[PDB]
Symmetry: C3
Subunit: 308 residues, 3 copies
Amino acid sequence: KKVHAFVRVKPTDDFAHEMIRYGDDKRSIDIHLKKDIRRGVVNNQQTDWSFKLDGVLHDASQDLVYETVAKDVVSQALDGYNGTIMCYGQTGAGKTYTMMGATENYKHRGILPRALQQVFRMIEERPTHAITVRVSYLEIYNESLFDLLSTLPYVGPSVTPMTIVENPQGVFIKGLSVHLTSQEEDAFSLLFEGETNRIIASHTMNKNSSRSHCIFTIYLEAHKYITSKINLVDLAGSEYINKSLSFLEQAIIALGDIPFRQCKLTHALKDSLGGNCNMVLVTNIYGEAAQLEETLSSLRFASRMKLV
Amino acid sequence: KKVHAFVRVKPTDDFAHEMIRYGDDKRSIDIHLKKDIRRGVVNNQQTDWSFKLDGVLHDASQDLVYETVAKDVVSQALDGYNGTIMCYGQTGAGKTYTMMGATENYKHRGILPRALQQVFRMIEERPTHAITVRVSYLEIYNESLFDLLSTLPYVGPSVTPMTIVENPQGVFIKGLSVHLTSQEEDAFSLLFEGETNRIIASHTMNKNSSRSHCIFTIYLEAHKYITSKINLVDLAGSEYINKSLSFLEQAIIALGDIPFRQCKLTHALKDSLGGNCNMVLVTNIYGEAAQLEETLSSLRFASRMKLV
Amino acid sequence: KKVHAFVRVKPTDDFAHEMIRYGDDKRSIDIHLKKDIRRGVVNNQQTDWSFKLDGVLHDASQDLVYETVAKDVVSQALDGYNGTIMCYGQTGAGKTYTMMGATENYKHRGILPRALQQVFRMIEERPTHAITVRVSYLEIYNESLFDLLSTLPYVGPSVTPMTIVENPQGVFIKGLSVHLTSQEEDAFSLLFEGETNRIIASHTMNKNSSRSHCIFTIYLEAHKYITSKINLVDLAGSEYINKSLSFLEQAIIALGDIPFRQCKLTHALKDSLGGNCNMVLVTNIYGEAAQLEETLSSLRFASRMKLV
Ligand SMILES: Nc1ncnc2c1ncn2[C@@H]1O[C@H](COP(=O)(O)OP(=O)(O)O)[C@@H](O)[C@H]1O
Ligand SMILES: Nc1ncnc2c1ncn2[C@@H]1O[C@H](COP(=O)(O)OP(=O)(O)O)[C@@H](O)[C@H]1O
Ligand SMILES: Nc1ncnc2c1ncn2[C@@H]1O[C@H](COP(=O)(O)OP(=O)(O)O)[C@@H](O)[C@H]1O
Ligand SMILES: [Cl-]
Ligand SMILES: [Cl-]
Ligand SMILES: [Cl-]
Ligand SMILES: [Mg+2]
Ligand SMILES: [Mg+2]
Ligand SMILES: [Mg+2]
């Protein structure tokens, strides 16, 4: 099966025990909101919701998230199948921790570095194959495209103009620099550089990072001549404040039941949505009562993926 | 003299002894087709043709081809004279073997690697000159331009748009990457990379390589301030199936007796045709009877160069 | 104070003692032309002029010029303030010697190499700051833009098209290559490369270098997140032969009392003129009588800066 939707709950000392309930199947989650105090509201409002997804992860290690959501998609990529892993959820819920993780201790590193590590590990198990790895790192902010690995990465589209294009092989970004990474250390160094660059560019350009989408792309070529891309995506916060998410959610509604070019995000991800791609959605949610309404919104989104 | 036309015959256990005859002068070749069996045809059809070119090479070593067709043109380049060496002929006749040669034993390497070797050797004989070498590698396929040394060389013009341009110094390719090669090993590595890339791109883009033109360019700068280019060209098979050859043949007809921009090939080679260039044509022909008609077509083309 | 104007007199065995007089204040210079021999002219013509600038340097060492005109502006740059140092004056007066200096002995090196040296020295005094240095090198000639560090730097705008652009951060040059310099040796090597390239490009493109403007840009990023540029400018000779200077002089007249886009120079330097920049003008003048008229023209220009 090509599309998966998971939920990762953020750990908390103050878990909403009464309001958040995990199914025995480890795939279900039920939300029980507190009844409204207003007499007109309390007897007209739905307070209970049930959701069945591909997996629900709470108090899950980084190692376990990777094994569960990511490992297979990265495996299929060396065989020529495009894979996208996307983190979605409100600001603070755990998207960047899930995708990047701790930048200063191995055990707590996230999906993206483990993906790079797995690619190069896998290349060792295929000694008769000439496997070549390339990377790019793109930020989308307010309908503008930024190259996190460009030669002057703290200045905008005026200097480094980029345009999403399409060909028989998929969707690429004209102007977005593509870097050959011979070994995992080359790929790790570039991930570090682009992350440093992202931070500098947010300060330099007065961007709110909660509103940006970041897409790290691994381009694979192995020769049987095969090519693929793995897209590792940290989305803008879903609390819609960030318009482009609405086109992404609209797209996913359409696929379940599309103007891809209407939005940079949906255009960049066209090949990840319509058909020829292993899509994994990781839905980051708070475990606390005060965020339950945004949590339900995220879970309703997560729940659209089974119909795609 | 600025224009030379040679013929190289491909070696064969089944040579067409009755039908292919080499002149004593080592410059002539005569073709004697078999008479048609049809009564209306046999007494109205020309079966004998004679051709005089600058040299006819049969059962010739790689070392001898280089010394004969290429060596002088590469010499003149360090002195500031542009040089083009072009292989022409039907698919299977020996264009790629003549231009690239054996990629896995020194003795049988072709023109292109020997040219790179000669350039850097010559730089050693000129110790008071600061000589700088740069390279590019371009494939032309079906009126599209591809950079064999680009950062993502298995995707097309959509990502890496290129445009042939002209200035007081000649014709160049905007968007085509140009690589400084400090030593012969840097140039050899890039030739290897672009060749690997060509193969991957043919599989990835479903190109038939018999239909593509490939142009390796050596840009020389030596300081008396001098610049030159050496263009080493492996043309599309001449069996016209490949349209662009017809504009090249038309061009050469015109020069002997021009809309350069009508065709990418003729535009890219504008400076190699009209005037200020040492042009060497190497015409690759089969030695076998079954290919004699295409052989004659190639020799008629080869024979247009003496009038240029 | 943001704008400074200095004068550097070129040393001479034949100094114009009667006609050139230095004020005690080391900031003033007076010019006394020789009376015209024509009866109608001599009693209607001004022969005496006085000028007060920020400093007048005669028989000044390279070390002293740097300390006086440049040192502070380079200091302010690490703190986030943009700085431009510009050499102006007639061909032969000392612009290139002041800005580049002797390329073959340390003591006599000019402003530009000392600036690069000071930047990297200063980075050592700031061990808790991550400071990143980038460079570009641009020649402006006859309204065309050239990249002195491009991949084929002896061919023009046809291959390497560049466009001056503007954003909330200032004015940059789309298409102009930007090079990360990790250490002073990387920056020194690129300065050497671009200078070699400039010379080759002047011969190759038949440029008169007295008519070109050259702008070496140091891009600084330090993290408090700060960015700046230092622009080190060697202008075209002011003997106007070179049109673009007239728009620069017009601009400076306007600021003292603007169509920046009318001229590549003024557009490239927009951020150096209107407001947010530490501008230092170094006015190179001959010490000899035969050049006194061009000297006065330069000093009248130098004198416009105090009103900016
Ligand atoms: N599973 C988790 N375990 C421990 N800490 C987490 C986890 N998920 C998120 N956090 C922490 O919560 C904070 C917010 O997480 P982050 O990934 O930055 O949210 P988002 O990217 O969705 O805005 C971070 O300081 C991070 O350390
Ligand atoms: N002079 C030669 N000596 C030995 N083998 C040759 C020679 N010319 C061509 N060949 C062989 O013939 C085949 C076709 O040659 P190739 O150069 O690929 O043709 P083209 O490029 O014109 O299609 C190759 O396998 C090559 O090894
Ligand atoms: N202060 C100085 N001390 C010694 N020589 C100088 C000085 N200024 C200029 N020169 C010399 O004068 C010549 C012209 O100077 P240059 O800097 O090339 O002029 P410009 O760049 O203004 O045309 C050079 O040969 C240079 O060595
Ligand atoms: Cl963990
Ligand atoms: Cl041989
Ligand atoms: Cl000095
Ligand atoms: Mg985040
Ligand atoms: Mg071939
Ligand atoms: Mg000069």
